[PDB]
Structure formats: structure tokens, C-alpha cells
Amino acid sequence: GIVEQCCASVCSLYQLENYCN
Amino acid sequence: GIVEQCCASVCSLYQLENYCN
Amino acid sequence: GIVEQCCASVCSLYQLENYCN
Amino acid sequence: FVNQHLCGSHLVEALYLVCGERGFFYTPKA
Amino acid sequence: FVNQHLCGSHLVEALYLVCGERGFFYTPKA
Amino acid sequence: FVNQHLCGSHLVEALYLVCGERGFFYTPKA
Ligand SMILES: [Zn+2]
């Protein structure tokens, strides 16, 4: 998921908006 | 100590219970 | 700057005193 | 908002900021 | 409680949580 | 005060402690 990319590659806060309720 | 392992290898919270007063 | 060294090498708090207003 | 390299605890922390009172799910590949 | 990889500041922070008002000692090999 | 290895968020955090109400500038090589 994001855990994978946010650490191995890079992510954006708008992508982290996906994991919210 | 734990500083060494908790970083170089891995540790458990029950092992961190050892460093408490 | 310090961002570079504080991470790539090492820095001291007295060097971080330089970035204050 | 730029591209962030977020690992470990710093990641669930960024979720706290981005979601707040909405809440979130932390699902790392197990 | 699972196996944690804890380095640097994140370690004394995990001690804060695990010990609390009991207190702790932070002794890294010097 | 000893020699610290400070990266990422841990760095602006050390600035918060060292400067406080004086304020600071965070300028990383872009
Ligand atoms: Zn960290």
C-alpha cells in the first residue's frame, strides 16, 4: 500500500487522504 | 545493551520493561 | 547548510544556535 | 504539500495530521 | 506487543511509554 | 550538548528546542 511506497519510494499528502475514514 | 539490539536487530516491549526503575 | 551536515555528517546544538532569529 | 519520504512512526503521524477527527486505517503489507 | 525496530530518539520514547511514572535508565554502549 | 546525528523531522525539532520563542529558519539545500 502506502506504507510500502511512502517509505520505499515517495508519497503525497493527497495520497494519504485515501487512508482516512 | 538494548540500545544496540533495539536498533541493530529487533526488541520487544517486555524486553524494554527491563530498563525501568 | 546544517540540514546537509546535521544529517550527512554530524552537528552540535551550538551550531544549531546559528539558525535562530 | 510536496513529496515526502515517510517511514515507520513518521507515517502514522502524517496520517494523524492529514485525517484528524475523520480517523484513519493503518494497513502495512504484513 | 510485536517485534519493533527502534533507533535513536524513537527508542527513549518507547521507554517513556513502557515505564512511565516508574522511570527509566538510558544506557547505550558509549 | 554532544554531537548529534539529526535527519528529517528530527532536525526541525532540535531547532524548536534550541531556539524556542526566538524562532528559526529551516533552509535545506533545495
Ligand atoms: Zn525518525
Reconstruct the topology from this structure:
The complex is a heterohexamer, with 3 copies of chain A (21 residues) and 3 copies of chain D (30 residues).
Chain A: H1 2-8, H2 13-16
Chain D: H1 9-19
Bound molecules: zinc ion.
Organism (chains D, E, F): Bos taurus
Protein name (chains D, E, F): Insulin B chain
PDB class: hormone
Strand count of chain D: 0
Q: Which range best describes the helical content of chain D: under 10%, 10-25%, 25-40%, 40-55%, 55-70% or over 70%?
A: 25-40%
- Series of secondary-structure elements of chain D, N-terminal to C-terminal: H
Largest sheet of chain A: none
Q: Over the alpha carbons, how many angstroms does the gyration radius of chain A reach?
A: 8 Å
Most extensive interface between two protein chains, with residue counts: A-D, 16 and 21 residues
What structural class should be given to the helix and strand makeup of chain A? mainly alpha
Which geometry of chain D do the CA atoms define? flat
Number of helices of chain A: 2
Q: Span between N and C termini of chain D?
A: 28 Å
Q: Give the percentage of residues in beta strands of chain A.
A: under 5%
* Strand composition percent of chain D: under 5%
How would you sum up the global shape of chain A?
flat
Q: Please give the share of residues in helix of chain A.
A: 40-55%
Write down the oligomeric state.
heterohexamer
PDB class: hormone
Keywords: Hexameric form, Carbohydrate metabolism, Cleavage on pair of basic residues, Glucose metabolism, Hormone, Secreted
Assembly: hexameric
Entry title: Crystal structure of Bovine Insulin (Hexameric form)
